[PDB]
Amino acid sequence: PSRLRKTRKLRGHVSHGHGRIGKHRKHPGGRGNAGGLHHHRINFDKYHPGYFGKVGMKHYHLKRNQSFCPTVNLDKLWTLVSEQTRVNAAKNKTGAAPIIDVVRSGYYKVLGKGKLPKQPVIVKAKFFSRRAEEKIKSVGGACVLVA
């Protein structure tokens, strides 16, 4: 809605909100990111440090699918199965533990943030972190790998 904007309130004011002294001119200072090392250097250094120069190794023909490896944490681990699964395991008399397949749920690596409920579980994952494996063992479970 153009009726809600400043231009409707600036009718009758000669400078249209841009000043009488400095005016509104075409491109004072340059176009785009001009003079980022010469006369906009303070702004670039203050708000975008690291902008100038190269760091690291370049790598031609990067394929993101190769490095595709989504991660899941142990606190969200039990959300990948149904609630029926967890309650049945908790109330189960025998020591049978359910299997959680994070590759089936769409994750490749299990990370160790959080804590687990005190009940065993088998976790199938491509990769495990050290603390995630330690916690899964700590709750009496097992970590088994898949390819």
């Binding site: 708000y47 699918n65 025998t94 049978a96 299997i99 050290r130 479970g141 097992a142 790998l145």
Partner: protein, 210 residues
């Protein structure tokens, strides 16, 4: 000119973009035209399935998608051969074929040949001359049981084998997943240089006594 904090932006509007702007006001008309063409094609091939030939079960290539499975271009010649279908009759009876696809694994091979045999069991074939039914089908199963199929023929569907809960054994409990992964990475990294060092050690060993 930058103004206080902000993102350094790089618009790609330096190249006279307004001469090449594609509007989409013909999108609803295009959808209507495509739907009319689909309906006309489905009418033209009256009992044949509207979506077209059956497609093979095909695993997706890269490591991001190899867990999924989808529909391919056509059945491979090895699949057709072991299913007993001629590669020039398959396209006549509505089987898409792909001469350039290979079968690396017997599992995928057998999956696709069971798919082909299921399609052949579900196929109804009309004789060329209706008054002379030579080898197509019985008239009882094609008088009213013939019907144009809507949607892809036998759609390719991802299936998950559900594992029941089981008792964790001590061997599984004593498996070391992180250590095994780290050692596997180290072995794959150092396999070649270890072999080179063994080579040089053997070369010195065979001449140590001289």
């Amino acid at each position: 000119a930058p103004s206080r904090n902000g993102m350094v932006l790089k618009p790609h509007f330096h190249k006279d973009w307004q001469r090449r702007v594609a509007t989409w006001f013909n999108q609803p008309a295009r959808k209507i035209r495509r739907r009319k063409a689909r309906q006309a094609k489905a009418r033209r091939i009256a009992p044949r399935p509207a979506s077209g030939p059956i497609r093979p079960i095909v695993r997706c290539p890269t490591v991001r998608y190899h867990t999924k499975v989808r529909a391919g271009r056509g059945f491979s010649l090895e699949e057709l051969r072991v299913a007993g279908i001629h590669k020039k009759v398959a396209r006549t009876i509505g089987i898409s074929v792909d001469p350039r696809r290979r079968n690396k694994s017997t599992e995928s091979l057998q999956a696709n040949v069971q798919r082909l045999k299921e399609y052949r069991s579900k196929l109804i074939l009309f004789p060329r001359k209706p008054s002379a039914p030579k080898k197509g089908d019985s008239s009882a199963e094609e008088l009213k049981l013939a019907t144009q199929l809507t949607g892809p023929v036998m759609p390719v569907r991802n299936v998950y084998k559900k594992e029941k809960a089981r008792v964790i054994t001590e061997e599984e409990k004593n498996f070391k997943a992180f250590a095994s992964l780290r050692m596997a990475r180290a072995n794959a990294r150092l396999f070649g240089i270890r072999a080179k060092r063994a080579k040089e050690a053997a070369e010195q060993d065979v001449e140590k006594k001289k």
